[PDB]
């Protein structure tokens, strides 16, 4: 059950344990009962070193969980800027859709992370993307009172 152990170590941010498991043949793409991989867990918990090791060892940067959630959605939502950059460099899909048709730009805009919104924009994020209910990132930014982000999205 190396896969289960890799999932646990990735979430807990145990760098040494992750390298040993990988060197012992753990499946870098193992999925838990919600469809999350080690990359999803490390991205959400903000462990940058583990994200980089997983990618170097073949982790699927675009893997999606049960609702379509990708590691970039989680990094964007939680506001981990360095992980967002690393994921984008590795081929992360800026336009992936999850849950209700949320795009990583929707999640960064709602959570008020301005620099991440800008990075996503520079990498091709669709400013006009609508979730299932018609809302764009601009709409979510404003509704959560993030004016700074709203203005940036309007200009874009």
């Amino acid at each position: 059950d190396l896969g289960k152990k890799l999932l646990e170590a990735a979430r807990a941010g145990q760098d040494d344990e992750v390298r040993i498991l990988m060197a012992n043949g753990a499946d870098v793409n193992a999925k838990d009962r919600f469809g999350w991989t080690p990359l999803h867990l490390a991205a959400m918990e903000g462990h940058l070193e583990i994200v980089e090791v997983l990618l170097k060892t073949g982790a699927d940067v675009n893997a999606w969980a049960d609702l379509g959630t990708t590691p970039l959605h989680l990094a964007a939502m939680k506001g981990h800027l360095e992980i967002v950059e690393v994921l984008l460099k590795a081929g992360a899909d800026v336009n992936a859709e999850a849950i209700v048709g949320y795009t990583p730009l929707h999640l960064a805009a709602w959570e008020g992370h301005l620099e991440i919104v800008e990075v996503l924009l520079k990498h091709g994020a669709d400013v006009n993307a609508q979730d299932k209910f018609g809302k764009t990132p601009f709409d979510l930014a404003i509704d959560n009172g993030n004016e700074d982000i709203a203005e940036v999205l309007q200009k874009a």
Partner: protein, 144 residues
């Protein structure tokens, strides 16, 4: 069966979040493996997504008139590309989140009605899938 599961999970989450106290479904520890399984699964699912489903619930801006349609739209979205056990857990987490949001906006009738709509959705939509997938006994095996 289904009604009891919904009542237990929603009751448990409302108590967990401090919205309600005292006698009723969801009060005290799970009486039943199915109920324990859904509590544990909902809890784990929710710690991952943090405020995601509470934020979605709020984004709907439900009114007593629109709430059923909005609930139904979200549920349909969650089940896009077919049901699996994880999407079912999301559906319970969202239902409980919508009940909590209704408490926030002081629509108390919706706390009960959303639970009614959850049962009806399960029975009329996901019933066929659940049964063929091994029923709730299988869910319990995997998530308990």
């Amino acid at each position: 069966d289904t009604r009891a599961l919904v009542a237990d999970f929603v009751g448990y989450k409302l108590r967990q979040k401090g919205y309600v106290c005292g006698a009723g479904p969801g009060e005290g520890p799970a009486a039943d493996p199915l109920h324990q399984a859904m509590r544990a699964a909902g809890d784990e699912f929710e710690t991952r997504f943090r405020r995601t489903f509470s934020d979605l619930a709020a984004q709907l801006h439900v009114t007593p008139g629109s709430a059923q349609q909005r609930f139904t739209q979200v549920s349909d979205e969650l089940f896009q590309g077919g049901p699996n056990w994880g999407r079912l857990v999301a559906f319970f987490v969202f239902g409980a989140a919508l009940c909590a949001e209704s408490v926030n906006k002081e629509m108390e009738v919706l706390v009960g009605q959303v639970q009614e709509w959850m049962v009806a959705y399960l029975e009329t939509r996901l019933a066929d899938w659940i049964h063929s997938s091994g029923g709730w006994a299988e869910f319990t095996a995997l998530y308990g």
